[PDB]
């Protein structure tokens, strides 16, 4: 079947769109080459639509059947409950797309207006009707990148397909508890979203170390969501239903599967019929969990098909890393081709052919890699790194155009130990917060696909809890990290690191002059900028924060919230 | 001055006391030699009173003045707030000693009866009157031990000295926030109560590793509370007051210091005047924090006096470990004598002279030592161990006489990776919980001096969070751990480990037959008892638990609660 069919109606914007980075003295002090920064818009929706539309064929085999049998057995030891309406409402992000039925996120979160009665009505209809397709809206995402001259120029917008807010709340009542329990039960240590960046690094280090002669690869599926078949989605349902669930949840889960998850009609923002979907919806609660489980089953089965020796996997939605025992140069290349051919039969063909790697630091997981630097007293510290170009480009856009749900804060938290976060993002944003006099205001951001709310003054505690006190004393960064950052700064027309150091000394002094939590930010976040360094003590707040749970699957379009 | 003066009136029981372990088929199946197990009672109060009563002289010097100056500077960066009455009430343990003024812990926790109005009245009196000594009650603690023939036989009861429940709630309003923030600020990594057992092991490993040639010792102060002088306690106040505090807190803290902390009259349970105290009260909120800070100041100053080279300390109340650079056998012995002489001038004379140790595993912190075993795939795992004799003796008593606040559950959690917890305590208590049909009931226990509430069915998640999945797969225990446990079991007349293994196989099967969380306990806690072992996956609940904060100073008599 085809992943999508189309009527010819346009994918239309629901609001004015801007493609070019606006000029502005605040953003200009971060980077000058604003014509290199662009935002995707509906203008390129048609191009994306073409890419994500294709035929799927799927031929399964004994390896697949055996893996699925195991997964269902493991799933049978899981017990999950319904969420109450109030609980599901509290998980709705502040700016979640408003309903067509006369209420928005504000009303959901406060249990006011039409919200409660409408959501109750939707739930009852799910229990009574397991058949009628539920309508969805398709939209072009507005996301910011830096041009890549020698690589095609500009990426087309991603497409997001989602049902009404009322349905999204019902999804949580039916399935949120399952998202919290099922992935770990069926995939164990392989489930990537259970890990903080530090824990992901630790897992990868351990996986690598336990092989006599390690070989790893990442596998890039072309347009994962579109490769997911109706049968795949019904198989996800059979896994959900293997858990112990109350009848009412079983009923709602089956209805959501047949009315929403497996496919349905898509409309544009104008209300015109735009097409029909027969693949994964990109904006539902189960997008991430579903992709993770389905990638895992296909990938484990393909390892068996290929004869991969002692696979250890890290799976994050459609992002796949496989570490195993090397069988030699030529055998590894051969086995990787067999792996790809099996994945292809299972409907998950490759975007770029996988490559065997024999150095752990070359393996990418979710655009990130392991890097190493020195902490206090020369000890080696491993941490997660990435290319800073996209983060820096988005930081610039978000300085001039305020995003209700930003990305710079998510990047500071996830990549806190990196040289670019420490010297550039922290310096720039603490300066901006002081200019705005908004240091002590909670901000919403996205991380691991979902929404969080944090007060920038709590960053030292958050960073310590997630990355350790060493995040504040890292030095002797790797050559790759140093070239990576210098290159990105030059490319974007940003000041070089030596200029950022000068800037940070002043930002630090200004924070310290304010006393209180602002002074803590100055002392801890900017210890790197002074020659007479302070000895930093463990922050009490770092333990007092409830954060252990922070990292979970999340949702499609990230429609899950935690403050 | 003398630590105490006495009137001659008796230290009297407030309830019937039992000295001998009762016989009972449930407790007998744990250990048969019941005449070896005893409980301290008021019968031996007089003997303890003699031991804790002595003259104190204190001569300070430039090393002490310099350390204190530093501590106050660090304290000045701390900001703390008052707790509201409601907050302080929620921190009161369910069975806290009832007030003389017609209410108990139940009324405090529910904010009902006379409790609120009485506590308000006490607070106002603290603000108005900084002078009048506050009365306290002195009691003999009832604690269980095993006889030590060749070591004096039976220990006398410890004494506990505490003010009325109403005052104890006011202490929390005034000072709880300080307990959460100040120790880490002034002592940094040295503050021991911030660490879980695993983190304590990690700290000690790191401290040892960072010395070119490590030497460590523990220092045992004779009767620490009694060595604490009125000046010491007023110095603690000056440290508290160095923080940024609201005037009302400053006022209450000064009044509590002068009316309660520095000394005051003691009465027995009959209401007779028993004596007067001029040293640390053993049952106040500040007992642990106070002892920790005062031990730290004296110990750091004494290191300077002695010329100890590069001290790294771990301080837990009066429990002190010092790791430093060895200066050679003879110089180390000499320097340790100088350290002791300085501690002695500062009023903290030794019970047993400190001994230099050159093997990390021989260093004791809070009766515990580092041990090592093998986890999955042969990797070395370090963890905290102790002698199991006292835990086993108390487990027996608590099987036949139910304690409102027990110790066996605290021991299972703290020492989860140990062979005795895994094979003996877990087997015995899960069996007992099934006999009683109370598996799924919250239990209160003491840990690190304070009270916690846990449901035994949550143990696998708690254990994983605190100790890692390896707690469930440890093998190849050390020779010392093996001899230690075999010896203790023989001494107490308990079955040998091979019998416990047989017992556990049946307990495991019974848990698994029950499904649900009980089956999880069977699979995870008792994987060691089966030859065909299950592969255990990470438990979702382990992250979903808010536990990062669990470990803090606590309070005297442990009058702090967290469910």
Curated annotation (Swiss-Prot), chains A, B:
Membrane topology recorded in Swiss-Prot or TrEMBL: Single-pass type IV membrane protein
Cofactor note: Binds 2 magnesium ion that constitute a dinuclear catalytic metal center.
Regulation (activators, inhibitors): Activity is up-regulated by PRK2/PKN2-mediated phosphorylation.
Domain RdRp catalytic: 214-332
Cellular compartment(s): Host cytoplasm; Host endoplasmic reticulum membrane
Binding site for Mg(2+) 2: 220, 318-319
Catalytic activity: RNA(n) + a ribonucleoside 5'-triphosphate = RNA(n+1) + diphosphate
PTM comment text: The N-terminus is phosphorylated by host PRK2/PKN2.
Cofactor: Mg(2+)
Function: RNA-dependent RNA polymerase that performs primer-template recognition and RNA synthesis during viral replication. Initiates RNA transcription/replication at a flavin adenine dinucleotide (FAD), resulting in a 5'- FAD cap on viral RNAs. In this way, recognition of viral 5' RNA by host pattern recognition receptors can be bypassed, thereby evading activation of antiviral pathways.
Subunit structure: Homooligomer. Interacts with non-structural protein 5A. Interacts with host VAPB. Interacts with host PRK2/PKN2. Interacts with host HNRNPA1 and SEPT6; these interactions facilitate the viral replication. Part of the replication complex composed of NS2, NS3, NS4A, NS4B, NS5A and the RNA-directed RNA polymerase embedded in an ER-derived membranous web.
Protein name, entry field: RNA-directed RNA polymerase
Protein source organism: Hepatitis C virus genotype 2a (isolate JFH-1)
